[PDB]
Structure formats: C-alpha cells, structure tokens
A paper describes a structure:
The cholesterol-dependent cytolysins (CDCs) are bacterial, β-barrel, pore-forming toxins. Finally, these studies reveal that the CDCLs represent a large family of pore-forming proteins related to the [name]/MACPF superfamily and are widespread in nature.
The crystal structure of the [name] CDCL shows that D1 to D3 are highly similar to the [name] D1 to D3 structure and D3 exhibits the characteristic αHBs of the CDCs, which refold into the TMHs of the β-barrel pore. Importantly, the position of the F/Y-F/Y-Xn-YGR motif residues and the glycine pair are nearly identical to the cognate residues in PFO. The significant diversity observed among the CDCL putative binding domains suggests they may have evolved to bind targets specific to each species. The CDCL did not form oligomers on liposomes but appeared to form stable dimers, whereas CDCLS formed SDS-resistant and heat-stable oligomers.
Numbering used by the authors: 34 to 59, 79 to 485, 492 to 516
The structure:
Amino acid sequence: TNNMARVELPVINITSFGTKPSFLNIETKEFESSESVVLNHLNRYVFPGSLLMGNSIQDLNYKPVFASLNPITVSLSIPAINQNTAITITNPSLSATRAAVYNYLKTADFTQNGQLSYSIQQFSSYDELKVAFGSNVNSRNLFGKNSSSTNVEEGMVARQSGFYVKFYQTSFTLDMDVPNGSLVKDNNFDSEGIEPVYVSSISYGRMGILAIETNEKAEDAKRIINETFNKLFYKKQTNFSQEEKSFIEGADFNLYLVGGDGSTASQSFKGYEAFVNHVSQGTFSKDQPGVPIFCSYSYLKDNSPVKTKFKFDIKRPPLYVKLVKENMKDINFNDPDGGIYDNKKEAILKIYFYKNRSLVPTLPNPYINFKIREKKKKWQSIAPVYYSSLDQVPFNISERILTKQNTLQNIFATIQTQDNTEFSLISRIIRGGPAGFRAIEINDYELVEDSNYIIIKD
Ligand code: NA
C-alpha cells in the first residue's frame, strides 16, 4: 500500500561432518542457489507471476500477496525436444497458467520422459539435503530423521557412508520475461510492510531425492550408484552387474518423491526389484504433463533474482577407536608342577575405527595419528618369588608410544609391534622353576588420549 522493507533472507547454516557438495572447493563454505524445490503441497502458489511474502519463501511457508497483476509473457519450453514457444498470460494466476499450458499441449508434440538429470552428493547430516531442496526446508522431517536412535545422534547418517541422488525429469518449463514496467497494476495491496517476491521461473515434471546409507566404502558407493543411475535412469537398462545388485540389496534407500501427478511419496526400500521400480523413468502425458518441481523468485521492486545463501560449517567426522587383540594365542609350553610353567600370550593388535558408539565403521583419512601406549612391565628373579597379586610385583616399568595411521585406507589397522611378524607379545609369565614367579613380561597396550579421537575401551 505504501513503502516496503526488503527482509534479508538469512544465510542457511548447515553443520556437516566431513562432507560437502561436490561443486565446492573446485572449516566453512559459503555459496548460493537460485532454484527451490517446490514441495507438492505448495504447487498452488507456484505459477508465473505468483506474488509471495518476501519473508515467507526460504522456510517454504509461502504466504501469497493478493494483488492485481499486469499481463506477463512466458517462454514455454519442452527441453527434451528443444521446443520453445512464447505465450502471454493476460491475468496471472494458477488457473491462467494451467489454461494456457494445457491448451498448448493438446496440439503440440510432447515428450514421453522429458529431459533427464541426476547428480550425486555425499552427506553426513540430513540438514545437508537442504542444499538439494534449495531452501531451509526441514529435510530431517522429510526423511524421518528428527528422532534419536539409542547412542546415534539424531539427524545423522547412521551407516558408514551416506549419499543422496537428486534426479528429475523436466517435461516443460515456464520462464517469465522480465516485466517492462510494473508487475502489479496498483500499489494498494497489503504486504504487511514487506517487499514481496514473485515466481519468475518454473520447471515442471517430477523429481526425487534418494537418500542412500551404506556401509560400503564411499569411493565404491559413489561409483556403483552413478553406474546404476546411468544404466537405469538415463539408458532405461536393467541389466546390472553382480556388484551392483548386491550393493542395492544391502543399502538403505529413502526416497522423497515430488510426484509428477501432484502426489508426494516418502518410500524406504531395498533390493533390485524396488530400485528398478523407483529409479525407472517416469512417463508424461498431456493429461499428466508434470507439476512444478522447482522454481525461482524475483524481487518485486527491481526484478532482481532472489538468492538462497548456504554456509556449510564442515566439522571433522566423529572418530571412535577401539584397540582389539585378535588371533590371541596362549601357549603353555610345559606345566608339570615339577618346576616348569611357561605361558606365552600373543595377539595381533588391531585398531578399529568407528563413526559412533554403535560400532558403525568409518574410514579415517590416512594422516590422522593414532597413539597406542605399550606399558611394558618386566620382572625377573633367579628363584621364584611369591606375590599375592601382580599389583605387588616391583616391575621395571617402561613405556613406548606407538604411532599409526590408516595407511592402507581400511576400517581397521594392524599395529605391528615387533620385527617380521604381525603378533604382539601380551605376556610371558614363568612360574616356579617350585610355585612362584620366575619371570614376568607383560605388555599392556592401550590407546592414548587424543583430541582427534574418542577411545572406546570395551
Ligand atoms: Na511440487
């Protein structure tokens, strides 16, 4: 009605844990998007010219501003068949858009599958999927991740590796010409003091965001996902390999589908049959030609593009480590209680790397330093000495700090402690020689406290 304030859209702050979208750095990262996925409950507000409260778009809590609008001219493209046609919509509204579109399509050549696209991103927090939606939508709620599993933080990838596949089929697009003058006819409308935005570009069709958690290794998961999407989604081919089918059988899949008929589907699944049902190309027709899957907005005053700003706070992935004695061999070389008792306890030391206290594996980068203390207690006597417990033995104590990295890039590492063998000496105890202690060598190995990891001692 009178003057209007431009509400600055806040920077969307995303905390991630070792992950970011592939298009970055090519810790903190700032970047921008200009397309927003249109959840299908909002489709009625997403049409060329649609006027929305300027402070209501980033959280997707669209609030329309009722106003009388001048005619608008849009380019209607079917990109799968490189067709472009200009149409003027005299009275911008949802229903003016649909009447123009449906009427054009009844006579036009169309597309069965539209223009295909997919892209893969790694992620660790479900907040990061906000990037794929191009808004501050609560992606945790959309994927069912706003509750805490016992001893695994809420909103997180639970398995080793998380990936999301944003994939969509664009049947047609609507792109406004920049208004030559005023988008609105008269400035009596009530925008509650706030400069509004209007919808200036829309892509139509169907879109999914497929969340994939898996315990396979990130490098192999990215590869398998990409190759199966290429084969199935791009090339309509179901002949997968033995490697692909088994990854599909073991991965957790969570699909958020912006259906091309207006429906919204959240589907969890597993298995090659399900994967082929949900990743196969949808099909369009003239009576179901697609619905808004993403859009872009422009400011009313100056038609300038509304930008959604993202700031990733990339934290270090959580690292839990457990020292474990494997292939334990305990040999009593003799023991007749006629002098001799010789026990040699040997094991292969392994550190296992974990994402959380539920023992989900992780693969720390090869530069993180793991420290293991070898506390050697050594004690000898020519004749056997009686101690009620080993606490009372006057050990010659000595310590080494062993340093190890995940050189071989696995979810565990063997800690070699001696030349030309993988075995560590845990204890050599000789008794009698008679029924007391003649020689005690025990190595107590324990992880050393460090800021780069949390020790699980179990
Ligand atoms: Na939608």
